[PDB]
Amino acid sequence: IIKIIK
Amino acid sequence: IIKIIK
Amino acid sequence: IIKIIK
Amino acid sequence: IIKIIK
Amino acid sequence: IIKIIK
Amino acid sequence: IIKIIK
Amino acid sequence: IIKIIK
Amino acid sequence: IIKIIK
Amino acid sequence: IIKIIK
Amino acid sequence: IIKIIK
Amino acid sequence: IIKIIK
Amino acid sequence: IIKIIK
Amino acid sequence: IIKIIK
Amino acid sequence: IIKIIK
Amino acid sequence: IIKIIK
Amino acid sequence: IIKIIK
Amino acid sequence: IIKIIK
Amino acid sequence: IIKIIK
């Protein structure tokens, strides 16, 4: 699981 | 699962 | 600015 | 600006 | 601006 | 601007 | 599953 | 499943 | 600015 | 500025 | 500025 | 599990 | 400035 | 588990 | 400035 | 487990 | 377990 | 266990 907010 | 907000 | 990942 | 990933 | 992914 | 993916 | 908001 | 909002 | 990852 | 990772 | 990791 | 807020 | 790691 | 706030 | 690690 | 606030 | 606040 | 506040 990969969750990113840029 | 990959979730990205740019 | 609101950014949300559930 | 509102960005949401469920 | 509203962007939503369910 | 409203963009929605169910 | 890949979900992206740009 | 791939869901993208640009 | 609000950024949240659940 | 608020940034939260649960 | 508030940054929290649970 | 990888969760990143930039 | 508040930074918390639980 | 890797959680990062930048 | 408040920094806390539990 | 790695948790970082920068 | 590694927890860092910079 | 390594906990660092810089």
Residue numbers in the entry:
A (entry chain B), B (entry chain B), C (entry chain A), D (entry chain A), E (entry chain A), F (entry chain A), ...: 1 to 6
Reproduce passages from the article.
To obtain atomic-level insights into the architecture of PSMα1 and PSMα4 fibrils, we computationally identified their amyloidogenic spine segments, and determined their high-resolution structures by means of X-ray microcrystallography. Segments PSMα1-IIKVIK and PSMα4-IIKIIK, both of which are conserved within naturally occurring PSM truncations, adopt the canonical cross-β fibril architecture, wherein pairs of β-sheets tightly mate through a dry interface, forming a steric zipper. Both structures belong to the class 1 of steric zippers, indicating that parallel β-sheets mate face-to-face in the fibrils formed by the PSMα1-IIKVIK and PSMα4-IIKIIK segments. Proline substitutions in these spine regions abolished fibril formation of the full-length PSMα1 and PSMα4. Structural indicators of fibril stability of the IIKVIK and IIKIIK segments, i.e., buried surface area and shape complementarity between sheets, calculated from the crystal structures, resemble those of eukaryotic steric-zipper structures. The contrasting levels of stability of PSMα3-LFKFFK and PSMα4-IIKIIK fibrils, inferred from structural analyses, were verified experimentally. Specifically, PSMα3-LFKFFK fibrils dissolve upon heating to 50 °C, and reform upon cooling, whereas PSMα4-IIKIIK fibrils remain stable. While PSMα3 forms cross-α fibrils and enhances toxicity against human cells, PSMα1 and PSMα4 form cross-β fibrils which likely play a role in stabilizing the biofilm matrix. The highly stable steric zipper structures, forming the spines of the cross-β fibrils, putatively serve as the building block cementing the biofilm and creating the rigidity that can explain the resistance of amyloid-containing biofilms. The atomic structures of the PSMα1 and PSMα4 derivatives offer templates for the design of anti-biofilm compounds.
High expression of PSMαs, which are four peptides of about 20-residues in length, increases virulence potential of methicillin-resistant S. aureus (MRSA). Amyloid aggregation plays roles in PSM activities in S. aureus. In the present study, we investigated the structure-function relationships of PSMαs and their short truncations.
